[PDB]
Design a protein around this motif. Structure first.
Motif, short mmCIF file in Angstrom:
data_model
loop_
_atom_site.label_atom_id
_atom_site.label_comp_id
_atom_site.label_asym_id
_atom_site.label_seq_id
_atom_site.Cartn_x
_atom_site.Cartn_y
_atom_site.Cartn_z
N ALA F 26 -24.03 19.85 -48.05
CA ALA F 26 -22.67 19.77 -48.49
C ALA F 26 -21.96 21.21 -48.44
N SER F 27 -22.61 22.36 -48.81
CA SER F 27 -22.47 23.80 -48.50
C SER F 27 -21.78 23.92 -47.08
N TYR F 28 -22.58 23.27 -46.13
CA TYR F 28 -22.40 23.57 -44.59
C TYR F 28 -20.67 22.87 -44.40
N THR F 29 -20.70 21.69 -44.98
CA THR F 29 -19.65 21.05 -44.49
C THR F 29 -18.25 21.53 -45.28
N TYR F 30 -18.57 22.09 -46.22
CA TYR F 30 -17.10 22.98 -46.90
C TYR F 30 -16.97 24.06 -46.23
N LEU F 31 -18.11 24.83 -45.82
CA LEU F 31 -17.82 26.03 -45.05
C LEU F 31 -17.10 25.67 -43.87
N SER F 32 -17.31 24.41 -43.01
CA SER F 32 -16.76 24.13 -42.04
C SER F 32 -14.97 23.68 -42.21
N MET F 33 -14.93 23.18 -43.33
CA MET F 33 -13.59 22.97 -43.92
C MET F 33 -12.87 24.16 -44.24
N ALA F 34 -13.54 25.07 -44.92
CA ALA F 34 -12.94 26.41 -45.13
C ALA F 34 -12.18 27.15 -43.71
N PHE F 35 -13.05 27.28 -42.61
CA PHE F 35 -12.85 27.93 -41.46
C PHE F 35 -11.81 27.01 -40.64
N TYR F 36 -11.78 25.58 -40.95
CA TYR F 36 -10.88 24.91 -40.23
C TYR F 36 -9.40 25.40 -40.78
N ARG F 39 -7.74 28.39 -39.14
CA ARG F 39 -7.14 28.43 -37.79
C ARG F 39 -5.63 28.89 -37.68
N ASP F 40 -5.19 29.63 -36.84
CA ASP F 40 -3.73 29.90 -36.70
C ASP F 40 -2.83 28.70 -36.55
N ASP F 41 -3.60 27.78 -36.16
CA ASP F 41 -3.30 26.39 -35.54
C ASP F 41 -3.05 25.59 -37.18
N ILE F 42 -3.44 25.84 -37.95
CA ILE F 42 -3.51 25.12 -39.49
C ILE F 42 -3.13 26.05 -40.31
N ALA F 43 -3.52 27.13 -40.67
CA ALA F 43 -2.98 28.07 -41.45
C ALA F 43 -2.58 27.65 -42.93
N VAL F 47 -5.79 26.54 -49.39
CA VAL F 47 -6.71 25.07 -49.15
C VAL F 47 -8.07 25.80 -48.55
N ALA F 48 -8.07 26.86 -47.70
CA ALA F 48 -9.21 27.36 -47.06
C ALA F 48 -10.09 28.18 -48.12
N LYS F 49 -9.25 28.79 -49.01
CA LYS F 49 -10.17 29.49 -50.04
C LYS F 49 -10.84 28.59 -51.19
N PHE F 50 -10.04 27.54 -51.26
CA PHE F 50 -10.73 26.46 -52.33
C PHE F 50 -11.87 26.02 -51.67
N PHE F 51 -12.24 25.58 -50.30
CA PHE F 51 -13.12 24.94 -49.82
C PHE F 51 -14.47 26.16 -49.41
N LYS F 52 -14.03 27.48 -49.32
CA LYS F 52 -14.99 28.43 -49.37
C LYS F 52 -15.66 28.75 -50.43
N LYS F 83 -25.65 19.70 -39.07
CA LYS F 83 -24.26 20.18 -38.80
C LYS F 83 -23.26 19.07 -39.27
N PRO F 84 -22.21 19.51 -39.72
CA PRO F 84 -21.05 18.65 -40.51
C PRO F 84 -20.63 17.42 -39.74
N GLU F 85 -20.03 16.40 -40.10
CA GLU F 85 -19.73 15.26 -39.28
C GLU F 85 -18.67 15.52 -38.42
N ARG F 86 -17.85 16.16 -38.83
CA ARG F 86 -16.54 16.40 -37.99
C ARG F 86 -16.33 17.92 -37.37
N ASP F 87 -15.73 18.56 -36.13
CA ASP F 87 -15.38 19.76 -36.19
C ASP F 87 -13.96 20.25 -36.58
#
Ligand SMILES: [Ca+2]
Ligand SMILES: [Ca+2]
Ligand SMILES: [Ca+2]
Ligand SMILES: [Ca+2]
Ligand SMILES: [Ca+2]
Ligand SMILES: [Ca+2]
Lengths: 153, 153, 153, 153, 153, 153
Positions: F26-36, F39-43, F47-52, F83-87
């Motif tokens: 669960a920690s790894y999946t949230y880490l993945s969500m945090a850095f998604y 992205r400059d892409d998403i920004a 929301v990123a700070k919450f998932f971290k 590895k998390p379900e999605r990238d």
């Protein structure tokens, strides 16, 4: 071979030892300059005070390289520290020109091996320009004023 | 035409744009003077420090005129900022005489368009009188003393 | 040749002069953008405030390169600062896309010659993504909200 | 001959110069010992810290004698500072026995030329007695404990 | 392709992803070591506390590389984090020798891709030297004393 | 068998090990969500700070279960962290719906093995209700406003 040694060439190890001796040599030359200007004979105490902490600054660089040598797993090999070139350093201009050559020789060695070496060299160039403006070697009043107004901060 | 524009002639609008470019030009010339006296070559750091905040003062005037232009409903039109007249500014006297002409040209333009422009010009006249008293261009000791005693506050 | 100059190629000296002019050019373009958003016409004061300190940031980089040039014994040669590309910068999205290209051109030049240039570029990419999410160019409510919530810190 | 020189024999002047070199020699040997115990190899950091400020203490004595030489109107003549006797100093006991001999040689010279030299020597004798009590050379646990409990203050 | 991506090779992007997984792997191995020394069985709580913040330090490096990847416009691709090599880590010496190999493998990867990696490795070499001095593996009193005097700060 | 082990079934010991791996997953999946979301892409940085810190919260639960396992005399057995379900995690609504399923799977496992798990799940349900009210997936202005007003506290 050392257990912490990883990707540190025998050449870098020998060069760091040359740099340690060079920095101790620079420290000794500045110490010599510091006590020359403290002579009753010469008596420019703020010029003397500048060369004494320059002497301390170079001894500190030598100790930091020795720290770095052990960190990387190299072995410190010390050599004799040669006596300074001169026993008398003439006047403030002569002494500053000798210090500029010394900092350029140290900096040359570091290239062959910084944000601080260039600061030090620009500072000595500034000093030499102002001593020539004040009329050194001949103008003793200029030399007295330089010790009070520039070297007194 | 702008909704906040009331009793602001197209002539005043064009004159404010000339004044903005003139002030940016003055700022650039002072910047050039500031870094000339910082050269190892020249090394009069309090003269350099004076020209750098003079450079900032003129850039601030240009931004205030731009503020005033928008306040009145005019439209800012910028032009190239021409490179300063010289790359070398000689000695402190030469540089101060060039700064006095520059402040008089800016002040002339403001007349054609103050309690601060006259203060600035009287200050540069005072400086030039004291540099001539100290024997500039020839007397380098005078120039050193001016940088310490007048420009060091 | 300069007395403090040691291992500084004539090529590095000429490149630093190109970089100084480029940074002054970037500063002037941001200044132009700052006063465009301050127009009664446009009135997005936090977008204007961002471009004004970006203008100050680039002018500071140019002064630091000039400092570095004298430190190394190079000689500063200034050129005209060209007027910005446009007098009007459209909307916040258009202006941010123009700022991203400008920071990439400055960064390209620095490569040919950093931890801060990439920070600045990632920041502008983040801004552009959020302006597209808010529906710019068409959605004026989105543009108002961006100025309040992102540019108001 | 010096204007402040009054009742200071040429013999005292030459002896003070021998003492300056001896103190710089002692400083260099302690510096060597300091960085030996900092090796990953050896790693007794409080023993290393003791030898580093001992190195500083001897360099301070040398500077005070140089001060005294100028005060009395003598002239400082510097010599090469010979490299330390060994590059490796064995274990803590071996190093402390070498330091006791070094302080006795310095103290012998001062006799031939104090409340502090005898303090320093009694301190090294105390240390050697405790290292022999802890079972050096063979007992590595004793050596570890000495570095923590005695050299850690 | 990403709008903030400028001069960032597909090779650097793939290498940063390998480094992220390697750092998470190192973090997991240290976590495993931390809870091994916390066993009632083993009970060396300052050794356990050291491995737990080492675990946190490596997880922090992995998050900083992920930050750097997004900053440069790369895309993070995560992989499984492999279970540590062992479930039992033997004694303090065995565990420290395994940690030294792990920090050298991480540092090797960073070379192929620092002032902190070498600090960490010198620290583990110092620890291993002192554990061998205290008589590990056999001397349990030595191991107890290391946990109190070195790992208790 | 462990000396502190009293009334702790081999089944509870194996279940705690499954829960440790689940929490690290669960920690790894949230880490993945945090850095998604970074992205400059998403920004969407709040929301990123919450998932971290959600990532940190789950890693803390895993360490507390490991603590509990040793306390009771069980032995920690670690497994690979998948590895998390999605990238890519789509938009804020998609990511929050994936986080709600993840917290329900963790909570299901804890039932089979709380005042905090139900708090976390009610919080994610509240978030999803508000994202649907703001018009996600389609309404990008809604998504921007959610990141500022709800995730900015
Ligand atoms: Ca010799
Ligand atoms: Ca021109
Ligand atoms: Ca033009
Ligand atoms: Ca010799
Ligand atoms: Ca596996
Ligand atoms: Ca897998």
């Amino acid at each position: 071979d050392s257990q912490v040694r990883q990707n540190f060439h025998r050449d870098c190890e020998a060069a760091i030892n040359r740099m340690v001796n060079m920095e101790l040599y620079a420290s000794y030359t500045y110490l010599s300059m510091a006590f020359y200007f403290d002579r009753d004979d010469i008596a420019l105490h703020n010029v003397a005070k500048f060369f004494k902490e320059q002497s301390h600054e170079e001894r500190e660089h030598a100790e930091k390289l020795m720290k770095d040598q052990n960190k990387r797993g190299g072995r410190i090999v010390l050599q004799d520290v040669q006596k300074p070139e001169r026993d008398e350093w003439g006047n403030t201009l002569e002494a500053m020109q000798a210090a500029l050559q010394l900092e350029k020789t140290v900096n040359q060695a570091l290239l062959d091996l910084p944000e601080e070496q260039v600061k030090s060299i620009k500072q000595l160039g500034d000093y030499i320009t102002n001593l020539k403006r004040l009329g050194l070697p001949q103008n003793g009043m200029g030399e007295y004023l330089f010790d009070k107004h520039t070297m007194g901060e």
